Amino acid sequence: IMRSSFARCFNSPIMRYAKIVLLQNVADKRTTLEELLIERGEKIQMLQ
Amino acid sequence: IMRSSFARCFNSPIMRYAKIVLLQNVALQRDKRTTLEELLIERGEKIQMLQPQQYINSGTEIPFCDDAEFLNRLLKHIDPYPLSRMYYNAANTMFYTTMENYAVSNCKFNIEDYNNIFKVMENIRKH
Amino acid sequence: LINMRRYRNAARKLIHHYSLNSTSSTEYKISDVVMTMIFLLRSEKYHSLFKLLETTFDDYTCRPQMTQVQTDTLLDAVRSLLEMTIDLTTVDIMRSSFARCFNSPIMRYAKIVLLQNVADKRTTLEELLIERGEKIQMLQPQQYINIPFCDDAEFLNRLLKHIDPYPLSRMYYNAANTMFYTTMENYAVSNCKFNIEDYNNIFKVMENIRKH
Amino acid sequence: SLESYETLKIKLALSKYMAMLSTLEMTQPLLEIFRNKADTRQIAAVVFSTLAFIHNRFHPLVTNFTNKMEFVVTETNDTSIPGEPILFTENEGVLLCSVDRPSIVKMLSREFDTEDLSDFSITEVEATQYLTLLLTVEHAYLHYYIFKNYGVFEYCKSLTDHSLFTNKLRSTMSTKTSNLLLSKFKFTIEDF
Amino acid sequence: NKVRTVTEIVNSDEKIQKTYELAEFDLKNLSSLESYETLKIKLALSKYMAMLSTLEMTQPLLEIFRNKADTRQIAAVVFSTLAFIHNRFHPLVTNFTNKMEFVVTETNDTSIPGEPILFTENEGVLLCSVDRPSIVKMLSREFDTEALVNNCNVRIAKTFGDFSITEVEATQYLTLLLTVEHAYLHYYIFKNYGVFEYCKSLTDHSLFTNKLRSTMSTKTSNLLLSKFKFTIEDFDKINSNSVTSGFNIYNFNK
Amino acid sequence: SLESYETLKIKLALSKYMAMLSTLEMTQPLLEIFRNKADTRQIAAVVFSTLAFIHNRFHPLVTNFTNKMEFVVTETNDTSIPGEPILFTENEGVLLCSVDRPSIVKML
Amino acid sequence: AYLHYYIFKNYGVFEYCKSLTDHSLFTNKLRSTMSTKTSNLLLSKFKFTIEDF
Amino acid sequence: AYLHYYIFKNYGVFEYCKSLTDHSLFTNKLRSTMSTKTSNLLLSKFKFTIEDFDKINSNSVTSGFNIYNFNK
């Protein structure tokens, strides 16, 4: 998280107003919420 | 800057041969029945993606007509036309179109709601 | 040092598309062309193919002279690269495709083209109809014919069970694109103008047929 | 003679709607416009002016109306609301209209049961189509008025539960809602 | 089941009544289900595969067409496919044209670019031409069998809650079925409107809409190629070479 | 007197068509216009306004009409439809008209 | 020409094209509801038949 | 979690997994019963908004036409 944050801060240009961003570029498998729901889903039921 | 330019260049698509693209013939619904509310949500999301068109009226005034001769003439022409048959035809075609859309959309038809639509009759009569 | 495996995979995919041996429609970028050319150069037994495709840079420089053993070896090399039949017309398709890709300018949106400049006699559909026409009647038929349509419910149920997981839309896409590519390759090889008006009117006929 | 007076009421209202449609400068009859997907401007104008006519009938003190309207002409099933061919609402004060053209075409193209010198004449099918479009835009206006009077949430809830037509229509404005031709008839559905 | 509707006007106690039969709405709803049409198409394909199986034609179609020596199998396969399509159009005749001959083409020199199966009259008997290398190239082409063509919620809810026919084989069966369907449309125009109209149709497929909709659109079932709307990618750009300042007064094909 | 009433119907309709043609600001009689291949604008105007008059007669509630019309004046046989001297249709909402001038000239 | 045009508007370019070759749509597609409307046409005031001799 | 569980128990697993990917169904499946019978929800004590929400959302903008805006 720190590496990504500092990379985005450094590559950002000098500007008068603070730029509001969201966390990104951390941790191949680009997924969405529903596939994760299914997938991790069972990995859950798998556990007793 | 040269590396960024090369990055933009290497991601440029190249020529490709044509392919046969398949388009959905009819908006076929899925097996599970849907209620009016979920259908409304989905169709509103679909409508959101459409491109609206601007309509500009010539003026703000409500359209109207006070030509007597034309009014009594239309009234005379539609005079021999029973109101019962006209209202029955209009209501029944409205109902048939609504039911056809419900059947095609795989949506459950609530008879009670459609009946409640036309209760302004008794609301007027009683009050 | 370069990664032989990634370059080989990119070359395999790009050549599969550019040889019309596959219907897989994947957006190809300039990077794939760079990788396929670099891999073709680096691999020793693809040197013939690399020189063949590199000669396409200038339209005035045409195909290098190869003796029959060289053509056979290059055919085996292409077959090995594709691990699949493949013959000379496939090489001609690849040469034309790569020539048109190379001479094309760098552009932001993929350019959609049709097969052309393969295989003197510039003809149309009707002269071919007549001509090849007789060459057909000239041949004598092999078989003379002078029908069970079983509705075994259990058997059709098992067949449907086997076919059920298949995404029908994908099957239709594959079949239609295969027919289109075979027709286009036959048109281009026969040096006959491919009238896509007629081919699209086929689909329009189907669409008009359904709604009645 | 009270029933004759009420029939005169209804038929005069229908004739006034007819005359408004005449003044609106139409090139084709209603159904013909609605089968013409190439000209959305005329369909939008017809729907908008029917809405304006209903608005004046419901609010007799209102003489003008907004001169702008964002509209979308629905063509495909996956963007059509069953039972609501026309829907009105507004966002950031701009009127928003949605028209389901195939649905209205099917409505007006049904086969209706049919149990001087200038050559002017009006067929029964034409008058019944006129009444049908008036009723549809009138239902849309009921939803629109529920929107204005009780919020977009009451509008959305009424889109799914039509009992707000009898709850939220208070008896104080009964004389106002009686001006609508939708109130002149009852349509019930009974299983058999 | 029937549903009754009553309309009442405020001028009297008169009530006008209409009865609706729900079966029509149920039929429309069933015809609107994606699974229903998918089942119809897959059942047609399954019937085709069963018809081939009972004729010993269990070998993959690509292998059948790759055998140069054995022509009888190719002729039987094409004839059976034509008969199956004919029965689909006319569900009363189980046997196709009782006598017809087959000639297999192995050369480009005598090949038709785009009509692999062609029909001709030798003044004595129907003759059918089969372009074997064209069909082989069709069936042997690699298929896109991993890409997805455009419900996750039902899958999520479920997660929280013997002849070996591969996809390639089924796609090959569908490809041959569609090809023979095109050939059969040409053959139908031939048999019903003469050799002149057949050779007119070979160069202009747009006559199909007029020579089929007159009889087929109201009597037979739906055609296999009508299951999806097919279009050529960037068709307008490629067609820009042939553009007319047109005035179409007989646009019989939209 | 019903047959007299029907004849009055027909002849009054014909006279109204006559008066519309008069108001349309014509330089020559109909036949004369139709032999004048140099002036296609007048022929197009006559055909278009006759179409508009028929449209109003068939639809008495319609009082106006489209103000644009794409038209081609047929001169050669290989672009003429037998039995259909004038044909109307529209594409992308634009009225399309085709007039077979020699056929109408022979008719008149 | 206007009869063909009205067939076009009311039933599609296909009904228009089919009516261009088969004129029985003038008596099929002209429903009796709009008989008063079509009676306004002077084409309806006369009959022209062709008989072989 | 309890709002998700309430939709689960009262409207089925299908509606629960629909809500997991779209929280906007809460307004329709709660206000019908909870808004007039229970107390106020803890997260309703303050109006929460994301800083510069419009700028970050600019990536997903629609030329929209909202006729069922059931959630303002």
Q: Is D179 on the interface with B (CB under 8 A)?
A: no
* Residue F88: closest C-alpha in chain E: E249
Contacts D189 to E, Cβ<8 Å: 3-5
Tokens of C86: 């493949």
Closest by Cα among D112, D133, D113, D122 to D31: D133
Distance from CA of B52 to the nearest CA of H (A): 7
d(CA H6, CA H59): 33
Closest by Cα among C82, C58, C62, C87 to C72: C87
Token pair 């103000």: residue: F67
- Which three-class secondary structure string do you get for E141-195? CECCCCCCCCCHHHHHHHHHCCCCCCHHHHHHHHHHHHHHHHHHHHHHHHHHHHH
Physical contact, D and C (3 or more Cβ pairs within 8 A) = no
Q: Is E235 on the interface with C (CB under 8 A)?
A: yes
Q: Which residues touch D184 (CB under 8 Å, ≥6 apart)?
A: B83, B87, D6, D10, E9, E10
Q: Are H66 and B49 a contacting pair at CB < 8 A?
A: no
Expressed in angstroms, the distance from the first to the final Cα of chain F is 33
Distance from CA of E252 to the nearest CA of G (A): 6
- Which three-class secondary structure string do you get for C179-211? HHHHHHHHHHHCCECCCHHHHHHHHHHHHHHHC
Of D70, D81, D156, the CB nearest to H65: D70
Physical contact, F and C (3 or more Cβ pairs within 8 A) = no
Q: Experimental technique used?
A: cryo-EM
Q: Helices C68-82 & C88-103, crossing angle to 10 degrees?
A: 70
d(CA H66, CA D91): 8
Of H28, H65, H70, the CB nearest to B47: H65
Of F6, F58, F88, the CB nearest to G41: F58
Tokens of A35: 């596939």
Q: Are H62 and B48 a contacting pair at CB < 8 A?
A: yes
Distance from CA of G41 to the nearest CA of F (A): 7
Chain G partners (3+ C-beta pairs within 8 A): D, E, F
Q: Are G20 and E250 a contacting pair at CB < 8 A?
A: yes
Q: Are E5 and D184 a contacting pair at CB < 8 A?
A: no
* Residue H15: closest C-alpha in chain B: B38
d(CA D154, CA D143): 9
Contacts E134 to C, Cβ<8 Å: 182, 186
Closest by Cα among E67, C183, C88, B105 to D83: B105
Q: Are D174 and B127 a contacting pair at CB < 8 A?
A: yes
Range G32-37, long-range pairs (CB < 8 A, 24+ positions): G33/D112, G33/D114, G33/D123, G33/D124, G33/D125, G34/D123, G34/D125, G36/D121, G36/D123, G37/D121, G37/D123, G37/F58, G37/F59
Residue to mutate among H24, H26, H65, with most D CBs inside 10 A, is: H65
d(CA E46, CA E39): 10
User: DSSP assignment, residue C19?
Assistant: T
Resolution of this structure in Å: 5.2
Contacts C31 to B, Cβ<8 Å: 10-11
Q: Are E104 and C129 a contacting pair at CB < 8 A?
A: no
Token pair 């040889």: residue: C19
d(CA D141, CA D89): 9
Length of chain E: 254
d(CA C27, CA C110): 8
Residue to mutate among F86, F96, F99, with most E CBs inside 10 A, is: F96
Checking DSSP bridges between strand D68-74 and strand D94-100, what pairing results, if any? parallel
Tokens of D185: 């008839």
Length of chain F: 108
H34, H10 in Cβ contact below 8 A? no
Q: Are G2 and F60 a contacting pair at CB < 8 A?
A: no
Contacts E155 to A, Cβ<8 Å: 34, 38
Q: Are C166 and E103 a contacting pair at CB < 8 A?
A: no
Contacts B63 to D, Cβ<8 Å: 20, 23-24, 49, 52-53
DSSP reduced 3-state for E4: strand
* Residue E1: closest C-alpha in chain D: D192
Of G9, G33, G40, the CB nearest to D125: G33
Q: Are B44 and H68 a contacting pair at CB < 8 A?
A: yes
F61, D125 in Cβ contact below 8 A? no
d(CA C86, CA C73): 12
Q: List the Cα angle A21/A27/A31 in 5-degree steps.
A: 85
Closest by Cα among C152, C189, F25, C206 to E223: C206
Q: Are G17 and E252 a contacting pair at CB < 8 A?
A: yes
Binding-site residues on chain F for chain D (CB distance < 8 A): 8-9, 12-13, 57, 59-66, 90, 92-93
Distance from CA of E129 to the nearest CA of F (A): 37
d(CA F50, CA F104): 14
Q: Are E249 and F70 a contacting pair at CB < 8 A?
A: no
For chains A and E, count residue pairs whose Cβ atoms are closer than 8 Å. Answer: 16
Of F57, F60, F64, the CB nearest to D25: F64
**Type and span of the H or E element at B21:** strand B20-23
Contacts H66 to D, Cβ<8 Å: 89, 91, 96
Distance from CA of F22 to the nearest CA of D (A): 19
d(CA B120, CA B116): 8
Q: Are D121 and G10 a contacting pair at CB < 8 A?
A: no
Q: Are F57 and G38 a contacting pair at CB < 8 A?
A: no
E18, E5 in Cβ contact below 8 A? yes
d(CA C47, CA G52): 83
Q: Are H21 and E156 a contacting pair at CB < 8 A?
A: yes
Q: Helices B83-104 & D101-108, crossing angle to 10 degrees?
A: 140
* Residue D187: closest C-alpha in chain E: E7
DSSP reduced 3-state for D40: helix
Classify the phi-psi angles of D59: left when phi > 0, otherwise alpha if psi is within -120 to 50, otherwise beta.
beta
DSSP reduced 3-state for F55: helix
Contacts G14 to E, Cβ<8 Å: 252, 254
Q: Helices D2-23 & D40-58, crossing angle to 10 degrees?
A: 140
Q: Are D26 and F63 a contacting pair at CB < 8 A?
A: yes
Q: Which residues touch D172 (CB under 8 Å, ≥6 apart)?
A: none
**Residues 9-68 in H contacting B (C-alpha not used; CB under 8 Å):** 14, 28, 62-68
Contacts D190 to E, Cβ<8 Å: 3-6
Q: Are E102 and C143 a contacting pair at CB < 8 A?
A: yes
Q: Are G33 and D124 a contacting pair at CB < 8 A?
A: yes
Q: Helices E22-31 & B83-104, crossing angle to 10 degrees?
A: 30
d(CA E251, CA G13): 7
Q: List the Cα angle E98/E99/E103 in 5-degree steps.
A: 140
Alpha helices in chain G (DSSP H): 2-21, 25-28, 35-38
Contacts F10 to G, Cβ<8 Å: 42, 45
* Residue H17: closest C-alpha in chain E: E157
Closest by Cα among D61, D62, D50 to D18: D50
Q: Are A38 and E153 a contacting pair at CB < 8 A?
A: no
DSSP F10-30: HHHHHHHHHHHHHHT--SS-H
Whole-angstrom CA distances from F71 to B8, D36, E247, F45, F78 are 50, 20, 9, 10, 17
Phi–psi pair at D62, nearest 5 degrees: -90, 125
Tokens of E118: 């062609």
Distance from CA of G10 to the nearest CA of D (A): 7
Classify residue F86 by burial, with Cβ atoms within 10 Å: 0-12, 13-18, 19+.
Answer: buried
Q: Are E157 and H14 a contacting pair at CB < 8 A?
A: yes
How many separate helices (H) and strands (E) can be counted in chain E? 9, 6
Q: How many CB atoms lie within 10 A of CB E246?
A: 9
